[model samples]
Target: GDLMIHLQAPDLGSLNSGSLVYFRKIPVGKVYDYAINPNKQGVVIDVLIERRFTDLVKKGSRFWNVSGVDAESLAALVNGAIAFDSPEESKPAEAEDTFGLYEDLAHSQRGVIIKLELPSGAGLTADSTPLMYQGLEVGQLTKLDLNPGGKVTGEMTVDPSVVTLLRENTRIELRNPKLSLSDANLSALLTGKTFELVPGDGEPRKEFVVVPGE
Candidate 1:
């Protein structure tokens, strides 16, 4: 019994069918196929893992593409490597599972996905909007969808370096353009609206509601 998984990468890089996949440096599987995303934004790589090792592909697992000098001297520059990590208590993944194929383990190992709920008609754009913290970009708004209650739900990816800032007491606010003629408001006026995060002092959290405010 074999289990299959789907991985999405920014590009094919040096990977192709039959590329070896590793877990903790031990071989466990191989790349089965590759195709371009329908959106033409990236490549989707299909992977097959032996049932004996299927337990390694579990919930909260992460995968990344490896290449260059680290994989195999000069040959890696052309072939690339694949690696994955599974949490200690993760449940075994089901067939046809999907995982984000990252450029490297550093990025794949860090960061957390968070959800934000904002009021309807907030005028915020998905995938192109930035999540700001004190005028600096700390995260990105990856998705936006409407909820049954008429509120807008957003999926955001916050930089791992700032993950500690998201806590139970944190507050997310919608910062809309102000009716001002000053240069301070010019950027907001052009960008329409964005989200601002106020770090909390309590335990870290991943869900938030965009409380209405100025």
Candidate 2:
């Protein structure tokens, strides 16, 4: 029998069949079967966490469905560092503590769930530019969708290494030069002050959800 990977809260039942699993913004597994555990409060989802991703299933790990207009935004909050498949002599040692954990059973797997909300009118296009800290690209504009209300959903991806650099007052903005404008506007552009986040150091830190500043 195949395994199932649930995408809902642990207290709830297993996720629907064919649920997707993403790690560090990458698809790593899928649900193939499921069963309800009467003794427990939740259902077990049978899944095939890829062999290459075995190392990711640590003691403290998180998991969630990566889809919808807010997928990118939610992935950022997890702050899971991606491990490349190629083994190298220069590879760094695995950290003792991880952000989340995935339980692997005889026919099921469980992981943490995170839901992200995207800002309206943002997306991953060829023109999409990821914000960088120093020379390191920290985050990028993924997608923007408008809800029924007047509000907008801004979807974005943030790197685990640069998550700490994003402050509460951090502001993400759009920049376009040569658009033609007033002297003041041009001066701001000239000084490289169009859109930017606040000042901070570049180091990995505990995961936290960031509110967008429109």
Candidate 3:
């Protein structure tokens, strides 16, 4: 039973057709083509999965953008793409089932579209701080590409969980924590000024509130 996989563009403004679709760093698929809906609101990308591995897809599978940064941030030099987690396979599939036959297939999927702007200068350090909450990294700057106008394009990932946390007041900054400037010595600054979020006695998710960096 062969199934054709279609890539649904969750963020049309970020990615386009013919983009690379990878499976655990292996080039497994590509955006064969894409088309915008009549309403011009979203896009649909046609993806061709190998007939041999068609049965591996299952419910609860997740997809997200990979490679390149979305915007310029000190974090760009560190990581790439928003991360997506695969659903846990609680029960083994029968040998006759589709996915059970291809045991080597990776369970993860990539986002339909990704936007990366390569920076002109040396990119940020690999250890650069990525945006995080509750000590969990949600997104990272992948590069510092520059445009003709000299504006640095920061590539980054806004994790699904973290994206919900972002608001009009959300601020992103980089820190060195050990620098001589302060305990939280923001060595290299991006996105303007420094800021921190301290949570109250409430739940970790609810306690977060942004404050100017000290």
Sequence-dependent TM-score of model 2: 0.34
Per-residue lDDT of 33-147 in model 2, one digit per residue for the tens? 5667676555655556666665544433444322211213322222221111212233332332222212221012221211234333432231144443332223444444566
| Candidate 3: segments with Cα more than 4 A from true spot | 1-3, 68-86, 90-214
| Cα TM-score per model | 0.47, 0.34, 0.35
Mark the 10 consecutive residues where model 1 has the least summed lDDT.
68-77
Cand. 1 Cα-lDDT: 0.70
Whose lDDT is higher: candidate 1's or candidate 3's?
Answer: 1
Please estimate how well model 3 matches the true structure, expressed as its whole-model Cα lDDT: 0.38
Candidate 3, residues 12-127: lDDT per residue as tens digits?
44345555444333334455566765764456655555456444344444555544322334443323222233344633222322221111112232211113332233424422
Candidate 1 lDDT at 164 equals 71
Q: Is candidate 2 or candidate 3 better by lDDT?
A: 3
State which candidate has the highest TM-score. 1
User: Each model's C-alpha lDDT?
Assistant: 0.70, 0.37, 0.38
Best by lDDT: 1
Model 1 alpha-carbon drift over 4 Å, by segment: 68-78, 110-214
